[PDB]
């Protein structure tokens, strides 16, 4: 018969609460806000529940500390993390958050092993790989939100330069969600017009493109330094919801995200940011961009960065 | 000539940021997030800006500490407040927030005097009255968000009892935004059916109605007790957005809010929670509910409660 | 796993095409446009398909003359009808459309017996009863769209008098979808305010209320006389989509529609317009309005009107 | 001061009615449906008005035969045309529709000369040029809907090949709205990946690309051959709405439409399909695609084809 869609949000902090808010507002699914901290998810769920009638949504949103409540979830979005913002690298959270995901993996494997898992917890790419390993869930049913956020920033900065609608900018960021991420300028277009043409027309310079690439890479610090007590959470929540939409509505949407890449980009099995097709069977395919030799090299360096952090985790305390 | 609609959010804390988020997502308007605290409004605006392309919105969202930036605002929403949740009474914030709203009133008077002003800062009804005095804005262009939140909770709790969609519940809360708020059970209907019929049908007891009424009055504590930093903010943000919508889209919408009532409900000039008609000229009308003798009495007590706290403010030692 | 929602529209004429258009635009489901007339559904589906990318929807919409294509449909909406608008009574289509529904019943019973069936074909109430009888589908899984259209008109005319947002008018029409339909003025409210109060305030007269009741009853002719070559189709399509939403999203929405009423309104088993709760198990409940003796009588006359047309069909050629 | 946005739809046939429907549903604006035929625009407006409460929209929709009613319109959309589908060429309607647009131009010049005008009437590119001449409106406030429809079909057919979401396909059709329209395969990307890469990857053949290009050019016939009354109307309506949105919400959106190109693409003053930037000042910019030699040649032929039919109109015998 018909059953309501169900999204479980593991971690009801800044990002987690926003996901429930937006999911409830859109009436995409029922939401289960999970957290180990007492009160937090219950208070947020009640608050969000009062807003549902205002939004004309019948989504049910509840708070809990019981993994039994995530039973039958179609999608699980993992935001759970140790406290304290990274000082200057997402990898500072590696050891703690790895242990958290061990716990989350057991809850998911027990109560909703057929769920599509979207990881957000940093260090993103290594956390996704660690989760798939420990949970044993199929590779196509486990991925990480990152590329949608990085590319959205990349697109937005390009859009803000030209003064155009950012939806009409096509632009991807690939590789690991770190300093090594690769905003692929070579495949950027604005309504079909490539950046090379705008350079010739004198409407953008290569230095401005380089500033935009740098800005994209360091964007997390710009937001964090202004917020003071945490990291970005409005956009990361929105990005996760877009990914959830792609799965639940079987969109076959092109989603840059951390997925298990084995026969593309010259890698033989690793979680990293790539353009994917997402539908009812999770990550259904990976697209291969035309990268320049410089971009292929930068990707290689990003791959090394992911492997480095991955090897550190293997030799953790 | 077409100009983008512009909404100023004065105070970029919990509620402020959510307003900017939702307004941006809906592409209702451009947003200026104002706050005295450094970084905070700039951080949230940047984060929210990155989500705009994800939502398919071209809304601009910026942060600032300069009232000149709210120039030409169509709507101004005031969340500015001193920190810390009230222990068990919204009046505790009286003098601090009154001083805050003085500077806000000066900012609005100078830079966007023709704007529609929606006050949220507690103690709500008194703050609205105070802002209008100091600012000198027309009574119909100044009002308070409260009734939509309180009525939404009332509707939600009624809907939860019958197991029906809350959107199909008509229910109003009137009077001041405090313990003396009056959920008008006499005017409640569920798809056309009044509570009296549900009693006779044995689908609800007067006891259950009394529990719902009480639950509405103290709903703020239930949320605040669980959050453990501050008070409700997801639903208050949404309520303010609905009010902004009614103005910007000239809905002629029935909106329970704190408005200047000078004839109806046996009062000659006071700001209190009443069902209004909001459109392009602000609060365009006030509707007279058919209140019972009991409800008239409870409303009278709320009027006194509001006049008390107002009188305390007028006597600045 | 996740499967896309699927709505089958049986009859791809004026109403049928609009349903697919709106369902596709909202991305509520995939749509199968069925018609026996060659070309029509194929042409409409291709046209609507080109619009999907404009709406940002991934809904698939196809045209067909093969009942196999409606296999696994969650909802079936029946608009199929003999040609030529009713001269002055919906019952003129009774004999022809009854035979059409015999055919439709066989397709549904074979290819999607677990579907929620929403009938639109006139004469609505008798056609719904005839379909349930011939198809053998459970009473709660078969209903007729009518009350949403009639009540929407009723609400709109009231709203247009007062100059208010029609969403803030609560008003029901019950009984059969014919001249005998009963707009229940006694349970009408505008933001909680009953009509009796507006009469006292001099803002509406009982004659104006009577004009509105009459206008509601004869609304179909007003539209038809202006369109010339057919009957209303924009609003009837929208109404069917709202009903489909209620089922697919398990809203528990209050939906006036033609449902099998057996223990309410003093009837012991008949399809007629009543306020229902609609969710994932179809018509899940019926609400009992407080009718005046005059309204109870008018309902009785509507019931007799339905029985009369029903008995004519039993003694058809 | 807030005023409701206002859209005039001149011609209330197939496309006109759909525009009013969708505009109303989205609450983008109020609508005035204009037509010379009696009843038709009034019938559709009344029907559509009944759907407004169902959609939760307060948009007004009215019918009229009086140009005074389009006074103060922000946008004017012209679907007015002689009846009957073209047999196999849009130019067949040339002289009839040219005379129709004379009276429309007079109506707009008198009652809403500051409006943004979106022409739909075929033969599109010539009609746009003709309307601008007779009306005397600024070149940037007058344009034609075509590219959005043609590009949407192009995107749709590309997306259907790869089995991906069409929203993630960037693709442009330029030149005149006719057989000589140029689907620019060189500027096509799917999530950043160009067609050249898909060839090398063996995911598409040049033959399949040629079929898609051809399919785009003759797409109108495929629909028209199946409808058996008139031509496509669901997607053209939606395309016009997207253009209206871009203007009313100042999107700075990339919109392929028939615009006055006086420098780019080696032309000095002609209306043809080009990718524009649309915002509050109408057609604010034109983008230069990086066309191949072949595409430059095909575009040149389209320019000649457009100049031919334009020249035939200028010589009124
Ligand atoms: N991938 C990205 O692009 C991206 C972007 C921004 C932030 N992030 C990351 O997302 C994570 C969440 O960020 P945030 O701002 O929401 O953090 P937060 O501190 O606001 O929330 C974290 C929540 O997790 C909860 N938690 C802790 N241990 C838990 C456990 N064992 N099980 C369940 N819940 C637990 C905490 O109680 C807290 O409520 C962080 O690790 C951050 O670095 C990722
Ligand atoms: N009306 C209602 O129904 C309702 C519901 C919930 C909360 N509230 C009230 O709304 C207010 C805001 O709640 P919150 O959770 O957003 O509080 P918050 O502390 O999160 O945000 C308040 C913001 O105001 C800013 N501020 C302080 N002084 C200022 C000044 N002079 N000018 C501009 N900004 C200034 C602070 O920097 C802070 O960011 C509170 O007073 C709360 O009691 C009302
Ligand atoms: N319940 C209501 O409130 C309400 C409101 C308006 C109209 N209606 C009714 O809805 C029905 C449809 O109206 P319309 O304007 O869409 O009619 P229409 O003539 O535009 O469309 C009817 C379609 O049904 C098709 N058809 C005929 N026989 C069929 C069969 N055996 N199987 C499948 N399809 C078949 C026709 O080819 C045609 O395309 C009419 O009977 C009308 O009276 C009901
Ligand atoms: N640009 C495109 O891509 C595109 C796509 C499809 C169709 N079209 C064209 O758009 C036009 C409209 O298509 P349609 O299906 O809506 O046609 P239609 O015949 O359904 O509607 C045309 C309407 O114009 C009205 N009309 C006639 N003379 C008039 C006058 N002097 N003033 C005002 N109104 C008048 C008629 O009464 C009729 O209702 C056609 O010319 C068609 O070729 C263009």
D74 touches chain B (CB under 8 A): yes
CB contact under 8 A, C47 and D242: no
Query: Token pair for residue B10?
Result: 């004065």
Q: What topology does CATH give the domain B147-317?
A: L-2-Hydroxyisocaproate Dehydrogenase; Chain A, domain 2 (3.90.110)
Helix residue ranges per DSSP H, A171-276? 195-200, 206-227, 234-248
Residues counted in chain A: 317
CB contact under 8 A, C228 and D43: yes
Cβ atoms of A177 and A124 within 8 Å: the answer is yes
Query: Token pair for residue A217?
Result: 């890479």
Residue-wise DSSP of D259-289: EEESSGGG-SSEEEEEEEEEETTEEEEE---
Phi, psi of D257 (to 5 degrees): -150, 170
Cβ atoms of B194 and C188 within 8 Å: the answer is no
Q: Rounded to whole angstroms, how far apart are CA atoms D8 and D30?
A: 8
Q: Tell whether omega for the bond before C123 is within 30 degrees of 0, i.e. cis.
A: yes
Residues of chain A found within 8 Å of residue B156, distances taken between Cβ atoms:
49-50, 52-53
How many Å from the N-terminal Cα to the C-terminal Cα in chain A?
Answer: 49
Q: Rounded to whole angstroms, how far apart are CA atoms C204 and C207?
A: 8
Q: In chain C, whose CA is at the least distance from the CA of B249?
A: C165
Alpha-carbon gap: B168 to the closest alpha carbon of chain C (Å): 6
Beta bridge partners of D77: D9, D118
Q: In chain D, whose CA is at the least distance from the CA of C38?
A: D226
Nearest C-alpha neighbor of C191 from the set C209, C171, C177: C171
Cβ atoms of A151 and A124 within 8 Å: the answer is no
Cβ atoms of C143 and C169 within 8 Å: the answer is no
D50 touches chain B (CB under 8 A): no
Q: Torsion angle, CA of D249/D255/D258/D264, rounded to 10 degrees?
A: 120
**Which residues in D198-222 are b (16+ Cβ under 10 Å) and which e?**
beeeebbeeebbeebbebbbebbee
Nearest C-alpha neighbor of A188 from the set A203, A174, A172, A165: A172
Nearest C-alpha neighbor of B282 from the set B244, B238, B256: B244
Q: Rounded to whole angstroms, how far apart are CA atoms A283 and A262?
A: 13
D241 three-class SS? helix
User: How far does Cα C111 stand from its chain's mean position?
Assistant: 23
Partners of chain B (3+ Cβ pairs below 8 A)? A, C, D
Cβ atoms of A241 and A261 within 8 Å: the answer is no
Cβ atoms of B46 and B65 within 8 Å: the answer is no
CA of B121 to the centre of ligand 2 (A): 6
Phi, psi of B160 (to 5 degrees): -65, -30
User: How far does Cα D9 stand from its chain's mean position?
Assistant: 13
Longest dimension (CA), chain B: 60
Alpha-carbon gap: A59 to the closest alpha carbon of chain D (Å): 18
Residue-wise DSSP of chain B: -----EEEEE--SHHHHHHHHHHHHHT--EEEEE-SSSSHHHHHHHHHHHHHHHHT----EEEES-GGGGTT-SEEEE----SS--SS-GGGGHHHHHHHHHHHHHHHHHH-TTSEEEE--SSHHHHHHHHHHHH---GGGEEE--HHHHHHHHHHHHHHHHTS-GGGEE--EEB-SSTT-EE-GGG-EETTEEHHHHHHTTSS-HHHHHHHHHHHHTHHHHHHHHHSSSS--HHHHHHHHHHHHHHHTT--EEEEEEEEESSGGG-SSEEEEEEEEEETTEEEEE------HHHHHHHHHHHHHHHHHHHHHHS--
Residue A87 is given by DSSP the state S
CA of B11 to the centre of ligand 1 (A): 25
B135 is in an annotated binding site: no
CB contact under 8 A, B3 and D74: no
Q: Rounded to whole angstroms, how far apart are CA atoms D286 and D291?
A: 15
Query: Token pair for residue D304?
Result: 């000649």
The contacts of residue D147 (CB under 8 Å, 6+ apart) are D172, D173, D174, D177, D255, D256, D257, D258, D273, D274, D275
Beta bridge partners of A78: A10, A119
Per-domain boundaries in chain D: 1-146, 147-317
For ligand 4, whether the C-beta of D294 sits within 6 Å is no
Helix residue ranges per DSSP H, chain A? 14-26, 40-55, 94-111, 124-135, 147-162, 195-200, 206-227, 234-248, 293-314
Cβ atoms of B232 and B148 within 8 Å: the answer is no
CA of C48 to the centre of ligand 4 (A): 18
Q: Tell whether omega for the bond before D81 is within 30 degrees of 0, i.e. cis.
A: no
Q: In chain B, whose CA is at the least distance from the CA of A241?
A: B54
Q: How many helices (H) and strands (E) does chain D have?
A: 10, 14
C13 is in an annotated binding site: yes
Determine the residue among B53, B58, B277, B282 to mutate to test chain D binding: the one whose Cβ has the most chain D Cβ atoms within 10 Å: B58
Distances, alpha carbon B148 to alpha carbons B29, B159, C39, C254, in Å: 21, 16, 51, 21
Q: Rounded to whole angstroms, how far apart are CA atoms C18 and A235?
A: 35
> Comparing B1-146 with B147-317, is the CATH topology the same?
no
Catalytic, C130? Answer: no
Conformational region of residue D149, where left means phi above 0, alpha means psi within -120 to 50, and beta covers everything else? alpha
C11 is in an annotated binding site: yes
Q: Give just the sign of the alpha carbon dihedral B155, B158, B163, B168.
A: negative
Q: Rounded to whole angstroms, how far apart are CA atoms B276 and D191?
A: 49
Q: Rounded to whole angstroms, how far apart are CA atoms C164 and B279?
A: 10
Cβ atoms of B8 and B115 within 8 Å: the answer is yes
Q: Torsion angle, CA of C205/C209/C211/C212, rounded to 10 degrees?
A: 140
Longest dimension (CA), chain A: 60
The enclosing H or E element of A280 equals none
CA of B48 to the centre of ligand 2 (A): 19
**Helix/strand/coil (H/E/C) assignment for every residue in chain C:** CCCCCEEEEECCCHHHHHHHHHHHHHCCCEEEEECCCCCHHHHHHHHHHHHHHHHCCCCCEEEECCHHHHCCCCEEEECCCCCCCCCCCHHHHHHHHHHHHHHHHHHHHHHCCCCEEEECCCCHHHHHHHHHHHHCCCHHHEEECCHHHHHHHHHHHHHHHHCCCHHHEECCEEECCCCCCEECHHHCEECCEEHHHHHHCCCCCHHHHHHHHHHHHHHHHHHHHHHCCCCCCHHHHHHHHHHHHHHHCCCCEEEEEEEEECCECCECCEEEEEEEEEECCEEEEECCCCCCHHHHHHHHHHHHHHHHHHHHHHCCC
Atom of ligand 2 nearest to the CA of B37: 37
Residue in this structure with the two tokens 């708020």, named with its chain if needed: B181
Number of C-beta neighbours around residue B308 at 10 A:
12
Q: Rounded to whole angstroms, how far apart are CA atoms A274 and A176?
A: 9
User: How far does Cα D239 stand from its chain's mean position?
Assistant: 6
Cβ atoms of A182 and A298 within 8 Å: the answer is yes
Nearest C-alpha neighbor of B206 from the set B189, B185, B175, B187: B185
How many Å from the N-terminal Cα to the C-terminal Cα in chain B?
Answer: 50
Q: Rounded to whole angstroms, how far apart are CA atoms B265 and B253?
A: 20
How do A193-194 and A189-190 pair as beta strands?
antiparallel
Distances, alpha carbon C32 to alpha carbons C16, C67, C70, in Å: 10, 10, 7
Residue A219 is given by DSSP the state H
Instruction: Tell me the angle at which helices A293-314 and A124-135 cross, rounded to the nearest 10 degrees.
Output: 50
Pocket test of ligand 3: the residue of C9, C10, C13 to mutate, having most ligand atoms within 8 Å of its CB, is C13
- How many CB pairs below 8 A link B and C? 90
Nearest C-alpha neighbor of A43 from the set A11, A12, A80, A76: A12
Q: In chain D, whose CA is at the least distance from the CA of A278?
A: D164
In terms of Cβ atoms closer than 10 Å to its own Cβ (0-12, 13-18, 19+), residue B39 is middle
Q: Which of C139, C177, C215, C264 is catalytic?
A: C177
D189 touches chain A (CB under 8 A): yes
User: How far does Cα A44 stand from its chain's mean position?
Assistant: 22
Q: Rounded to whole angstroms, how far apart are CA atoms D271 and B117?
A: 46
Residue in this structure with the two tokens 């804390």, named with its chain if needed: B13
Cβ atoms of B54 and A239 within 8 Å: the answer is yes
Residue in this structure with the two tokens 């808010």, named with its chain if needed: A21
The contacts of residue D151 (CB under 8 Å, 6+ apart) are D171, D172, D173, D256
Cβ atoms of A134 and A110 within 8 Å: the answer is no
D95 touches chain C (CB under 8 A): no
* Residues 261-300, chain D, touching C (beta carbon < 8 A): none
Partners of chain C (3+ Cβ pairs below 8 A)? A, B, D
Atom of ligand 3 nearest to the CA of C41: 39
Q: Rounded to whole angstroms, how far apart are CA atoms D241 and D15?
A: 11
Return the CA Rg of chain B.
19
Query: Token pair for residue C301?
Result: 């006359």
Query: Token pair for residue B204?
Result: 């609800």
Distances, alpha carbon D21 to alpha carbons A2, B186, C233, D4, D153, in Å: 30, 38, 11, 17, 22
Residue-wise DSSP of D105-165: HHHHHHH-TTSEEEE--SSHHHHHHHHHHHH---GGGEEE--HHHHHHHHHHHHHHHHTS-
Cβ atoms of A45 and B227 within 8 Å: the answer is no
In terms of Cβ atoms closer than 10 Å to its own Cβ (0-12, 13-18, 19+), residue C68 is exposed
CB contact under 8 A, B47 and A239: no
For ligand 2, whether the C-beta of B39 sits within 6 Å is no
CB contact under 8 A, C223 and D52: no
Q: Rounded to whole angstroms, how far apart are CA atoms C194 and C50?
A: 47
Number of C-beta neighbours around residue B224 at 10 A:
19
Q: Rounded to whole angstroms, how far apart are CA atoms B57 and B53?
A: 6
Q: Which of A50, A130, A177, A215 is catalytic?
A: A177
Stated resolution in angstroms? 2.2
Residue in this structure with the two tokens 């539908």, named with its chain if needed: A279
Q: Give just the sign of the alpha carbon dihedral C16, C21, C24, C25.
A: negative
Q: Give just the sign of the alpha carbon dihedral C302, C308, C309, C311.
A: positive
Q: How many helices (H) and strands (E) does chain A have?
A: 9, 14
How many Å from the N-terminal Cα to the C-terminal Cα in chain D?
Answer: 50
How do D189-190 and D169-170 pair as beta strands?
antiparallel
D299 three-class SS? helix
Q: Give just the sign of the alpha carbon dihedral A120, A121, A122, A127.
A: negative
Superfamily of domain B1-146: NAD(P)-binding Rossmann-like Domain (3.40.50.720)
Beta bridge partners of D10: D34, D78
CB contact under 8 A, B227 and A166: no
Q: Which of D58, D250, D253 lies closest to B2 in CB terms?
A: D250
């Amino acid at each position: 018969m018909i059953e309501r869609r169900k999204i479980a949000v593991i971690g009801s902090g800044q990002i987690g609460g926003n996901i429930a808010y937006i999911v409830g507002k859109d009436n995409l699914a029922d939401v289960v806000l999970f957290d180990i901290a007492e009160g937090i998810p219950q208070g947020k769920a009640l608050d969000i529940t009062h807003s549902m009638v205002m939004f004309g949504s019948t989504s049910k949103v509840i708070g809990t500390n019981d993994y039994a409540d995530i039973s039958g979830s179609d999608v699980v979005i993992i935001t759970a993390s140790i406290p304290g913002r990274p000082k200057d690298d997402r990898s500072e959270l590696l050891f703690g958050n790895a242990r958290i995901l061990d716990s989350v993996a057991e809850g998911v494997k027990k109560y909703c092993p057929n769920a599509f898992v979207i990881c957000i917890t940093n260090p993103l790419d290594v956390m996704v790989s660690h989760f798939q390993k420990v949970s044993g869930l199929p590779h196509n049913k486990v991925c990480g939100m990152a590329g949608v956020l990085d590319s959205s920033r990349f697109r937005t900065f390009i859009a803000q330069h030209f003064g155009v609608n950012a939806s009409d900018v096509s632009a991807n960021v690939i590789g690991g969600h770190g300093d090594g991420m690769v905003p692929a300028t070579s495949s950027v277009s604005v309504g079909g017009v490539p950046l090379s043409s705008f350079i010739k027309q004198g409407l953008i310079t290569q230095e401005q493109i380089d500033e935009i690439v740098c800005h994209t890479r360091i964007a997390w610090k710009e937001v964090a330094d202004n917020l003071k007590t945490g990291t970005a959470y409005f956009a990361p929540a929105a990005a996760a919801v877009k990914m959830a939409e792609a799965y639940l509505k079987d969109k076959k949407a092109v989603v840059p995200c951390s997925a298990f890449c084995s026969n593309h980009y010259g890698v033989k099995g690793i979680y990293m940011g790539v353009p994917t097709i997402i539908g009812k069977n999770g990550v259904e395919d990976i697209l291969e961009l035309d990268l320049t030799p410089l971009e292929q090299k930068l990707l290689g360096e990003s791959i090394n960065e992911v492997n480095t952090i991955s090897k550190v985790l293997d030799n953790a305390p």
